[PDB]
UniProtKB/Swiss-Prot annotation, chain A:
<feature type="binding site">
    <location>
        <position position="39"/>
    </location>
    <ligand>
        <name>FAD</name>
    </ligand>
</feature>
<dbReference type="GO" id="GO:0106312">
    <property type="term" value="F:methylenetetrahydrofolate reductase (NADH) activity"/>
</dbReference>
<feature type="binding site">
    <location>
        <position position="99"/>
    </location>
    <ligand>
        <name>FAD</name>
    </ligand>
</feature>
<feature type="binding site">
    <location>
        <position position="142"/>
    </location>
    <ligand>
        <name>FAD</name>
    </ligand>
</feature>
<feature type="binding site">
    <location>
        <position position="67"/>
    </location>
    <ligand>
        <name>FAD</name>
    </ligand>
</feature>
<feature type="binding site">
    <location>
        <position position="99"/>
    </location>
    <ligand>
        <name>(6S)-5-methyl-5,6,7,8-tetrahydrofolate</name>
    </ligand>
</feature>
<dbReference type="InterPro" id="IPR003171">
    <property type="entry name" value="Mehydrof_redctse-like"/>
</dbReference>
<feature type="binding site">
    <location>
        <position position="190"/>
    </location>
    <ligand>
        <name>(6S)-5-methyl-5,6,7,8-tetrahydrofolate</name>
    </ligand>
</feature>
<comment type="subunit">
    <text>Homotetramer.</text>
</comment>
<feature type="binding site">
    <location>
        <position position="130"/>
    </location>
    <ligand>
        <name>FAD</name>
    </ligand>
</feature>
<dbReference type="GO" id="GO:0004489">
    <property type="term" value="F:methylenetetrahydrofolate reductase (NAD(P)H) activity"/>
</dbReference>
<dbReference type="GO" id="GO:0071949">
    <property type="term" value="F:FAD binding"/>
</dbReference>
<keyword id="KW-0274">FAD</keyword>
<keyword id="KW-0560">Oxidoreductase</keyword>
<feature type="binding site">
    <location>
        <position position="98"/>
    </location>
    <ligand>
        <name>FAD</name>
    </ligand>
</feature>
<feature type="active site" description="Proton donor/acceptor">
    <location>
        <position position="7"/>
    </location>
</feature>
<feature type="binding site">
    <location>
        <position position="41"/>
    </location>
    <ligand>
        <name>FAD</name>
    </ligand>
</feature>
Length: 265, 274, 286, 286
């Protein structure tokens, strides 16, 4: 009864390109509900995001959702892009503002073009630029009311933060699924940098768990897998039936975590 | 409640750092490839400063370990092999080289309780004996096997080390029954980190160790997926020691099967680090 | 053992909050030389905690507005902190209010706590609008998790808070409460009403229960039975009252922090010890 | 809102405990005229709480046994309370111990806290047996939820407690702890070992953390990281330390009470304020 999705990013080197396709073959066997591919304005552009989406569709037949932002894009460009995507069978978009228009404006624009499945970003620990937690929650509701049919959370390591946030979403009348984004950690220095930039709290017990492992990739993997397996176990017990994995183009950890959730080939 | 409990459990584990004693069990290699692997694991695991390491039955490995690392290395000694006289000659030999700790077993005439008494009659060894939370296969009953452990301790055993187990409750209930029976030594959990479920299942079926339904299911479908087995097995073992540590267990014995990676990682989670 | 486990998790979560909590302190104008001395001692002590701002009350209908302004200037001069006067509209004409507001702004006072005040005309929302017309003030307004005593309904009072925010208020600060669930339920209702400002809990550390009970009864604030029982028999035991009160307040902020509250406003009544210690538990330290 | 609901229930349950909790207080022999004054002030204050008994320590190897006996007689004469001397066997022969015990009994002292004492022969269980041979004393003995530092194992230490109970001890009093789960787990293990006496938690209210940390480190008692963090930065702030410590102790006894504990032994270190207030929260009042 558990659905999963996997997020990938467009490879920038030949080596990473090989890694990604290996990972897609591995993870496709788990029949994810969808997969998605991120966008970076200065790290590959829309064309690379779209190329990987098309490649995934052709190779696997899976539903593949591009992350589409509105930064430095005009409404007419976004409409033209959306039409093209829809006509080419891309019918799920993760609608974002991007690292003028806010994301709710993009949701509205997209639904005007066609009846897209739309996913939007949610922040259990509050978007860094929000004027308040209340304002950020009202924004998520605006995005949902504009037509988003699921929210996907920023990653978190304090599970209670997700659970409390989900409760506040329900109280606010936000009736779509709030799907936890899960970041399996194999490189803690990299995770800490991402977390610091996004205001995501790293519990002291977790920082302690990675202490002394800067040069021990094997132990980091086993420790990180344990942390992620524990988290998904707790979340599932609390009624979560959908998980979105931030794979960073690697399959092994996400595949194993899915295994423990009973999501298997 | 589930979330808050895990946070508490994880933080409690974080704070035990520097208070857990561990030991590592190795076996004599049977090939050149396994020889290399063994000494690589010994070098990797020695950095953790185990209270002792042990070698199944051997004398050479024990000496090599002692000279190479200066760690207390306890040979396993059985009496299903030699005569009561030969043992005295074999035991007196160890004590005359620096071997002060011996794992006394009956072995896969006399029972282990007889070997403890004999060794004690030879010298003031540290003596570790085997315990069976799920009852030794030959024992007539749980109580008889329990009384036997008591005999072995009363004869001079100062540590008991358990057969591996996967049902934590079985261990905990057994530990309680031991104290109620007046056994005043710790019941040190033997931990078997599982990377090969087929192999672990074979071992368990030979030793009367139960494989829970949940565990069989966790390994279902992974016969050809070494990577996923390793992550799943590490998770299981890490969860086990986390629970055991909260229940006040501060000693763990690892059945490494001569491989360091899993036990090393599990130790790391217990705050046992270089 | 659920209760024990829950405590450890709550305590550890509190510990990891260090550096994330913003605090403010409310003072009142001293009426005696002794209270004047106490206040400045408290200001020195609490200023070391780097509060986001401090504020100074002004009693509606008192005619003692100059005392409030004098204390405000003294705080700014002495500490360099942002100091916000409370300003009430029930006892001044709009023209007088515009004059007072202009003088504040020209004196570098750019955060006002805008209130109606008790009836011995304008409502607080009218003052918010008047102030924003004068200059781009930071404006804080009163919120009532347990409903203002004069409100025709909880809905009317909630829509009034919305009115004040829509008029320009960029902070809401609550009346004190002892029923933590009441605050949390109110915070959720504020979202339901589309109010996008953070709802900052006002905390009253209790060292004198007789006094607190008088204030609570005047303001429609509920004192849970367990709290009444906790202070029973302590009329002549100031030491035990302080320890009991500190325990209550520390418990309250620990729970609020876990529920995501990262701003606290303390009703110090010009005393530093309790608020300082409560701040310490929140990781707000010199 | 689980956390808020859990607090209210725990607080209300504590309130309904009034009249059901038994308490005892431990004192030590004063070493200066100033401490002598403090002790008698504390005895007067705490005696009003009607403790089941009080006790007075005796430092093993100190040679100052007469000071303990003198304080005990003074307490009985002044308050009429049951007062129990601590008696150690490490530093006296069995004959001396029988003499001391007989003199106690003939002096109306019929509860002894029977201890081994630190090594500068007999174990505490030997003293229990010796005392019971002299007369039908009430005998209290030490228990260690976190295991006595010298024990060969947790099992050995637990069986030792059983030995002391089987020898005649009718109370067990624990070393202090700050990890509440450790006490609760130990209480369960005591049942598993067939020990039928109540395991009374010894509570150390902390006002001086440096001192407490020294004691804890000597006795193998764990200080949770959140507690270390709570006292960080308070070396020169006695006021905040007291409020923080009171909060910790009050939280601890609230949890213990909910788990069915109805007996508490306070390590007062001769000071009354904290223990008195903690007792107040348990409904133990004059
Ligand atoms: C699951 C997930 C996938 C992501 N994928 C990508 C990706 O592929 N590429 C990329 O560049 N970034 C990506 N991001 C990050 C995202 O782009 C940033 O977090 C960005 O800063 C906000 O995007 P958003 O869609 O959340 O914007 P919004 O929902 O519009 O919110 C952004 C901020 O604006 C505030 N806000 C909303 N409306 C108003 C208003 N009317 N007035 C004032 N403030 C307002 C919000 O409260 C918030 O603080 C992703 C984030 C998540 C959670
Ligand atoms: C940590 C550990 C390390 C081990 N290392 C080795 C090794 O290096 N080499 C090896 O060959 N094997 C090893 N073994 C396995 C062990 O040798 C076998 O399990 C053997 O079957 C029993 O050995 P034991 O020392 O338990 O014998 P025992 O303690 O003597 O008990 C064995 C059986 O005899 C029964 N029994 C004992 N005394 C009596 C009596 N007086 N009357 C009736 N029944 C009695 C007991 O209940 C039990 O069923 C190890 C086992 C463990 C748990
Ligand atoms: C943090 C804080 C600081 C304070 N500082 C002071 C101070 O320094 N000096 C002082 O004298 N008092 C102070 N007060 C108290 C305050 O002044 C009283 O509570 C007063 O009764 C209402 O003030 P208000 O700003 O909330 O008024 P309002 O927001 O105007 O509300 C007052 C009542 O009017 C009702 N109401 C609002 N608009 C209408 C309308 N159009 N028609 C009919 N009813 C309406 C509201 O529902 C409410 O019942 C403070 C209160 C708080 C919470
Ligand atoms: C409530 C309380 C009050 C106290 N009051 C005092 C005081 O007033 N004066 C003072 O000097 N100290 C006092 N102590 C401390 C005490 O004396 C020390 O902790 C001392 O080290 C042990 O005392 P015990 O009575 O617990 O000894 P025991 O119960 O005899 O135990 C001491 C150690 O010996 C081990 N042991 C017991 N029997 C044997 C055996 N047959 N063979 C090998 N090991 C054995 C036990 O496991 C334990 O490790 C007190 C402790 C508590 C908890
Ligand atoms: O939402 C943030 C997510 O895209 C990062 O974890 C990328 O890895």
């Amino acid at each position: 009864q558990i659905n999963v999705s996997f997020e990938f990013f467009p490879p920038r080197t030949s080596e990473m390109e090989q890694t990604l396709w290996n990972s897609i073959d591995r993870l496709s066997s788990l029949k994810p509900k969808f997969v998605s591919v991120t966008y970076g304005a200065n790290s590959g552009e829309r064309d690379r995001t779209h190329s990987i989406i098309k490649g995934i569709k052709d190779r696997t037949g899976l539903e593949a959702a591009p992350h589409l932002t509105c930064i430095d894009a005009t409404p007419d460009e976004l409409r033209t892009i959306a039409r093209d995507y829809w006509n080419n069978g891309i019918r799920h978009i993760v609608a974002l503002r991007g690292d003028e228009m806010y994301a709710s404006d993009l949701v509205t624009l997209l639904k005007e073009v066609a009846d897209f499945d739309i996913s939007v970003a949610a922040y259990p620990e509050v978007h860094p630029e929000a004027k308040s937690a209340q304002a950020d929650l009202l924004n998520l509701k605006r995005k949902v009311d504009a037509g988003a049919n699921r929210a996907i959370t920023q990653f978190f390591f304090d599970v209670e933060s997700y659970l409390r946030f989900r409760d506040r979403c329900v109280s606010a009348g936000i009736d779509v699924e709030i799907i936890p984004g899960i970041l399996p950690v194999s490189n803690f220095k990299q995770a800490k940098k991402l977390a610091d930039m996004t205001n995501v709290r790293i519990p002291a017990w977790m920082a302690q768990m990675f202490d002394g492992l800067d040069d021990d990739a094997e132990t980091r993997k086993l420790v990180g897998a344990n942390i992620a397996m524990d988290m998904v176990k707790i979340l599932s017990r609390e009624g979560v039936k959908d998980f979105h994995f931030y794979t960073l183009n690697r399959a092994e950890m996400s595949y194993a975590i899915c295994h423990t959730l009973g999501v298997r080939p």
